[PDB]
């Protein structure tokens, strides 16, 4: 049988032309080949996973195809047919990578939420039961769990809870005062509620992506200045209890991750660091100590808290450490190796193409944003209507991947005694690439009325597929089986100091939209942490 | 674009022929017309929210619905393949034709070749082994109540996505009692806050089970002392104590939930779990009169609990021909379910028969015979899915295929009778004619005979259910109207022996349920629109042989 999908004529024409240009195997590589054949898909699938996976996966080609089409329509409406055509061509041939493409015309990527609207209003967007604002710890924890479950299904990416412990403390104290618990059973009641939360957030084939952030004293003071709990108390008056509550959780998981063997929430510590020292050295020494066991907390370093006290400021990171009330509605990544391949070694041409493609990506992000707005107006994204997800606090994200491979193809990498590295010219070249992307991102605000950011994305699948497409198009000229999601590859034989220095040079140019992975005593570890923080690295972890 | 789905030639031929013979409209009615067009489907979906507001769902609903036409089409194809393998091409073609034109109704059709319909579980494996079919986190057997509750919740969520229908937990309170007592003994709770700790876990459980568009369908059963003693004779808790030694603790805990739910159902307005009380009733009286009077009392407020009446506990004793009640609304016995329901469109046969009852019965027998084969095919497919490791509920002994019926469903008994000229109106309201009652008897007895033969024919047990048919009642009527026009005057077919809305004396309604509930072994429900008054009426209904009923308010 053949089934009719009812596209506009011009889109049909476009897809026919692209098919003729690139062949069926490009489409197959893009996930628009056999994958759209339900019988093949189903019979192949049915040969760790169970049936629940099937119903999730079966529709992904189809909702991708619809999303591509819808984005094309909106781009045509906004900028004209040629632009829309060019974007579709770029997405299908792999010059760019639309993330969560099966969701791109239906819902947004991620957000790091505050729990205040929950505490104050409960969960009125759910009708199957009425949920009065909580008044005890058990209710609060339930509500939080349900909120996470609901948000994971209203979005494609991470659910961040950086101020979780702030609001948890309040219900701990309130419960304590009203004698719901015996004091001698406080810690048991706390750890119980940790267990309930942690257990519920590690349930399926894979768990939703959540983030916790250990806020230091500076961040707590800065974020919640003036703000009050429900009882009228000032939040800033309980900084030491909130800290105490966070440390308890951190200690608890390090013991418990052995036993119960869970991943989430992904843990980040946010520390204000200036002039060679931590402004909250206690918290820093605590995290440094805790991490000794598993190295399970990511180090977030900042030199300022102005961002967290219409152009958007605040850190956005797909792994963790996204600031409170910050996110991204969509990421679209630039294939930098493609551009290298298209440039033929000419760096001027490289930068002209880069610039042009980043400009296209902005137009697509704008179009996606308009579609999200359409979804909101259609009553489909209640997290917006209920002011939990804020569109004015979401970036459009320009992604980058394959910086190293791109530089390599340009002949700007080498190897000396200290292993693999960029050449001097290669460092200048990366400087220029990143400065160009920055320039365009910054122009974006005035151009389209919302803020753009940049991230060196994890690219778990993109790093493979973009490489495959480039190999398909450029053959032996593209030697890499996979593109890199760090400034210098994880597997690379290179001195740790170079790695660190690169991160110290380039992390700032993406405003912390990157991570550094670095593979006998506390003071040693802490000396290293300080050394890395001194060099300007904004987000890192040891393995 | 035109997208290829890779069917065998015979199936494509068949579908094209059916298309030529019935027209696109029938396919559109069946869910295989414009619904397969992702663009039309999506464009449609995103403005229903606009129409909603004009008249008076969110994006999470989109990803659920978009694939249903497609997984139904695959399921139909797969069932056709398996039926061709098992019984030959003519049968398979016949079944596909019947399914598409509305002679039968395949339930959960978008799931039918992928997972089973329903089960009423025991929580013993969860208590003893935890949730080892989940890998995202380790889940050792619970030691405390809070953990037990969490595990039950996650089990429900997990099982709800491994099946299409209800998740029944008949012995929930049996196992919850244990953890309550255990935490009381070890001083986890202060005695003086014991009731508070319990209600907190009633809250947690109940919140979570009413908290998705629509919540998973769950069932609770108040087991009377007879059921508890009969089911759990010889069984022990993890501490080695006999469960039967705790009958009065289990009862008290069950009454506590029923009381709390009644008080709380108003405040929070939730629906689940669906409450049934299972009561042993013999020769004019409740064998557990205490529990019956309690239920009677607590129902005075919302009538939120359904009455399950049985004359025997033999079936449920210890829990190869399968015995035990199966009901899609509530009251399925412990360790009972159905892997699939396929309903016979009885009005269709009325229309086909032209008024002749022997023709009617010949066609019916043939249809039920075909349905049996379809159910046998679906069963084999589920077994394939099990061997492919896709249905861990079976691998971990929570879902039991040998404890699952293949279900022959029925809908439109009344409308079928009316089309046949076998209904009327007398002084006590609408009713069957004398000949109509015999006709209904013959229908049910014929299905019964075929069901009983099926066991020898196919090696598993068949049951019968007068299904709720929330959608089938409309679609079947519509299709019949499309095929037969004004000879099918009903906008909707009925899911009770007598239409809920019909002006007919309660006594007749009761009488009909008393005549026919047993023929479908309790696969039906009777809705009927001071305390002693209520109790007397309950007893009057039970004496008449009604097996499952409720009052509406």
Automatic annotation (TrEMBL), chain B:
GO CC term, one of those recorded: anaerobic ribonucleoside-triphosphate reductase complex
One biological process term from GO is:
DNA replication
**What is the recorded name of this protein?**
Uncharacterized protein
Keywords assigned by UniProt? Answer: Metal-binding, Nucleotide-binding, Zinc
Which species does this protein come from?
Thermotoga maritima (strain ATCC 43589 / DSM 3109 / JCM 10099 / NBRC 100826 / MSB8)
> Which amino acid positions bind Mg(2+) 1, per UniProt?
200
* Residues that hold CTP according to the record: 105, 107-108, 166, 328, 469-472
Question: Is Ion transport found in the keyword set?
Answer: no
* Residues that coordinate or bind Mg(2+) 2: 203
Q: Name one GO molecular function term.
A: nucleotide binding
Q: Which Pfam families match?
A: NRDD
Is Cell membrane included in the keywords of this UniProt record? no
Q: Which Gene3D superfamilies match?
A: 3.20.70.20
Q: Which residues bind dATP?
A: 140, 143-144, 147, 150-151, 196, 200, 203-204, 207-208
